[PDB]
């Protein structure tokens, strides 16, 4: 019992949310280069045998709707779950195209008591987004 | 008679440390996602996932440094941040 059971019939879903273009009301820049990320991720996780779903330019309402729908699917035959979020962010927050949503609102759908067919199975969230405005000056070694 | 925490078995692979910006190249993609895909391609049949992510940390930390004409944003670095509530090892291979 040292490693997760990964020989279920299916590896699981990989959901890639790729937000590139933002509403003018957000004051957020277009995220050039994110399509390269999204395509690299799709190929990578397909090769890992995931069922990959790419989504582009979702509002925060659409992100929440998508994540809730995914969490209410039957994952009984799936080993794991992967969600990749590519967007602007702040600490604890990712941006829909029309504004911020708390990361906790997204991940809460997959809590052990709310997504019963994923209880006991690894739930991976990969987050490319800022977490604030600090910069790391580095140190020469 | 037995429960697990509702927060158990999550892994959050963040591109950057708490409080920090995260860097993206306008043509090559983000430093973190570039590195994550490279290490999964190279190591997913060889290494446990946390060890793959540790190689991602090292790749982002050592191979990338920003360029900016604005001195405020120039020559900056990045370390990703692995946050594990997993209870078992995760292998993509059997």
């Amino acid at each position: 019992d040292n490693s997760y059971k990964m020989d279920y019939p299916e590896m699981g879903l990989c959901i890639i949310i790729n937000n590139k273009n933002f509403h003018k009301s957000t004051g957020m820049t277009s995220r050039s280069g994110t399509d390269v990320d999204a395509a690299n991720l799709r190929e990578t996780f397909r090769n890992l045998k995931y069922e990959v779903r790419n989504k582009n330019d979702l509002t925060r309402e659409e992100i929440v709707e998508l994540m809730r729908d995914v969490s209410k699917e039957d994952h009984s035959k799936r080993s794991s779950f992967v969600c990749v979020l590519l967007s602007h962010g702040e600490e604890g927050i990712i941006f829909g195209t029309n504004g911020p949503v708390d990361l906790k609102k997204i991940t809460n759908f997959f809590r052990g008591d709310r997504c019963r067919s994923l209880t006991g199975k690894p739930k991976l969230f990969i987050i490319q987004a800022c977490r604030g405005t600090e910069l790391d000056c580095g140190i020469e070694t | 008679c037995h429960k697990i925490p509702v927060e158990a078995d999550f892994l959050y692979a963040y591109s950057t440390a708490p409080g920090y910006y995260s860097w993206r190249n306008s043509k090559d993609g983000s430093w973190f996602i570039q590195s994550l895909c490279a290490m999964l391609k190279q190591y997913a049949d060889k290494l446990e996932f946390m060890h793959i992510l540790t190689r991602v940390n090292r790749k982002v930390a050592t191979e990338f440094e920003s360029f900016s004409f604005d001195a405020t944003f120039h020559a900056k670095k990045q370390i990703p941040c692995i946050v594990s509530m997993l209870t078992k090892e995760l292998y993509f291979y059997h």
């Binding site: 820049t29 995220r31 967007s87 602007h88 490319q128 800022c130 | 910006y21 190249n25 306008s26 944003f73």
Partner: peptide
């Protein structure tokens, strides 16, 4: 160009 997210 390098940009922040």
């Amino acid at each position: 160009v390098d940009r922040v997210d």
